[PDB]
Amino acid sequence: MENFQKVEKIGEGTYGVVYKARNKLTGEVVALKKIRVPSTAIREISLLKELNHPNIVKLLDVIHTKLYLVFEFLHQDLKKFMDASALTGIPLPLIKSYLFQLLQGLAFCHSHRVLHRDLKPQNLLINTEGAIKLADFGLARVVTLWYRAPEILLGCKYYSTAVDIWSLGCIFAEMVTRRALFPGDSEIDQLFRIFRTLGTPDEVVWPGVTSMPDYKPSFPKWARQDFSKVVPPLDEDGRSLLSQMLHYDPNKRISAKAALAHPFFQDVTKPVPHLRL
Ligand SMILES: CN(C)CCNS(=O)(=O)c1ccc(-c2cnc(N)c(C(=O)Nc3cccnc3)n2)cc1
């Protein structure tokens, strides 16, 4: 740690505090995450050094002296960008570029059997070039519940790569509407917010749902709403893709690979964001 000069705090993540820091030897500006150490964690974290992709924040070094992760420094997070763009909204071409790149990053991770499990605007990092990257990929294996897949909330112990698709669908809706899709403040409020918009799931739409650990027959039965009401500024291609990212059954939910082939991305481009740094 004597090699790093902390500049400022840049976040307080799930499993530790994130700092902007300067490497005293190279002059490199990095993000330093101090982990809140088991042998299993050291081995699991070391495998993440090899998981390199243009849409994944580069994990430069792992320092075990208690545990520090040295990441490449991006200039802004998507939460700050969304807040800065709240008056006019993020232009649709930029939303589509960001969604397409995040799907590319997810397709890469998922092909290597690596799940994020906690996607949220605060861990999506952007640069002046138009790139967007996934941060904290693989760390999991006030807490925000807004992006949690329904199978996690219902007690599924062995959830799949579909959880990340659900989280990215929620973020996509939020970029488009400028409001969080499901802003729950408890696990039950999060579940019931999902049910109120998408309909209470049953055996018809989600075979096996009624046998899930936390499913209760006593759940209220709400009807599903149309996506025209859910995401109005989003064209029909965007709405059909979103609906497939938010399918209740994780087995029916679109994969990142199939989502990349969706007609919504026929006219994808890579615009430059207007970033105020
Ligand atoms: C807290 N606010 C008020 C200040 C920082 N906001 S920001 O948008 O200017 C910002 C956010 C994040 C990063 C940054 C850069 N490179 C990184 N590599 C990371 C990073 O790894 N972040 C992260 C987030 C959550 C959990 N773990 C890591 N963050 C830089 C600027």
Q: Rounded distance, CA 19 to CA 88, Å?
A: 30
- Cross-strand pairs, 69: 33, 62
The answer to whether the annotation marks 7 as part of a ligand binding site is: no
Q: Is residue 52 part of an annotated ligand binding site?
A: no
Protein residue with least CA distance to atom 23, ligand 1: 123
Q: What residue owns the CA closest to ligand 1's atom 4?
A: 10
Domain spanning 76-275: CATH superfamily: Transferase(Phosphotransferase) domain 1 (1.10.510.10)
Domain layout of the chain by residue ranges: 1-75, 76-275
Which contacts (CB < 8 Å, 24+ apart) does range 174-178 have?
Answer: 174/82, 174/121, 175/78, 175/82, 175/90, 175/95, 175/98, 175/99, 176/89, 176/92, 176/95, 176/231, 176/233, 176/234, 176/238, 177/231, 177/232, 177/233, 178/82, 178/85, 178/86, 178/89
Tell which residue, 232, 100, 110, 226, has the closest CA to residue 168.
100
Cβ of residue 122 lying under 6 Å from some atom of ligand 1 = yes
Residue 59's H or E segment, with its range, is: strand 59-64
Q: 221: buried, middle or exposed (CB in 10 Å: 19+, 13-18, 0-12)? A: exposed
Question: CATH number of the domain at 1-75, please?
Answer: 3.30.200.20
Distance in Å, CA 116 to ligand 1 centroid:
17
Tell how far the Cα of 21 is from the centroid of ligand 1, in angstroms.
12
Alpha-carbon distance values, 107 to 50, 132, 161, 179, 198 (Å): 16, 14, 9, 26, 26
- State the distance from the centre of ligand 1 to the C-alpha of 67, rounded, in angstroms: 18
Fold matches, 1-75 and 76-275: no
DSSP states along 222-263: PPPPPHHHHSTTS-HHHHHHHHHHT-SSTTTSPPHHHHHTSG
Ligand 1 pocket test, candidate residues 7, 10, 15, 139, most atoms within 8 A of CB: 10
Question: CB-based contacts of 268: which residues, under 8 Å, 6+ apart?
Answer: 96, 97, 100
DSSP letters for 17-46: EEEEEEETTT--EEEEEEE---HHHHHHHH
Q: Å resolution of this model? A: 1.6
